[PDB]
Design a protein around this nucleic acid. Sequence first.
DNA 1: CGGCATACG
DNA 2: CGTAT
DNA 3: GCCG
Length: 327
Amino acid sequence: WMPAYACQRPTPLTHHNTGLSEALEILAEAAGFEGSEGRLLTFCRAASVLKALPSPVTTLSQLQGLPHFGEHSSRVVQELLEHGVCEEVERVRRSERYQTMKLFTQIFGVGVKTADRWYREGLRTLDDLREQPQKLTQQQKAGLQHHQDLSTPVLRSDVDALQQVVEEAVGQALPGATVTLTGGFRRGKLQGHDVDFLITHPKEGQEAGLLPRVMCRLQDQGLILYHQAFERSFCIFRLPQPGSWKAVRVDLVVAPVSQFPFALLGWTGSKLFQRELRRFSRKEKGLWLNSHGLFDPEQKTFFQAASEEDIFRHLGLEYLPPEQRNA
DNA sequence: CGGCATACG
DNA sequence: CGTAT
DNA sequence: GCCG
Ligand SMILES: [Mg+2]
Ligand SMILES: [Mg+2]
Ligand code: NA
């Protein structure tokens, strides 16, 4: 009734076990702050299973037979059902370690490893970092200066305005090039913390060298608050606001049209969905999947895809639209 | 017990 | 090390 | 932390 891989089941954006999934994802996040990638994955998977259910979990027995629910995740659900709260989850929420690692990792340019080192040095607040800017990278200085704006959700109305200015710059850099909205917004999200665009051109090869030309034109228009040959660009855009503006994170990605279905699939997510899809491809089908293609290691050949539908078919999976990939 | 996705900047 | 889904 |  419940397949083991998230890519084998539709997962809508809104579901019937929000509180339970949120608690398990706290534990997944905390596992990540401690470098326990294995425990992070299990908690993430257990959370996604609940997102895929057709109704609320009301009794512990309803977890029987569900994949990725063992003693620990089941105990978390049990306590939430009996008391509306899970002691372990609440201890994590208020712990100084969790709050600081979460605060530091959400800085653009700060990963788990950097946040952990700063934590061990006694640092706890953003102003602690600001007072010692000599130890910050140029990327981290940008992320810290813009941290407040980058914490404000991006609205779908913002996305439309950004896509227009991106299309304009893309149109001058390479006539005929196209811009596709990807990421969480393509999955139907109404808010987000960044906007993701995928750029290609219908004539194979014409996209080569395109991203530097796009970036230089965006910068000349005064729209780039920060950015680093290349095919991925992690920028901070200047988004007009009523009587002012705000900083917004935008990712620009280029792919040749031959690889466009794979890049669209990869960059549409969710993150967990893509990990599960690549895991499923390798372990169940013996095929190697990434955002560039799908490789058969036996015949040493790449699978040609003209659409996401092609890719699902070549993996023996039923097609899922982006709005059902919210694992 | 091994494995846990796979890239690019 | 960071970034991305 | 859980699966095969
Ligand atoms: Mg995104
Ligand atoms: Mg992004
Ligand atoms: Na970060």
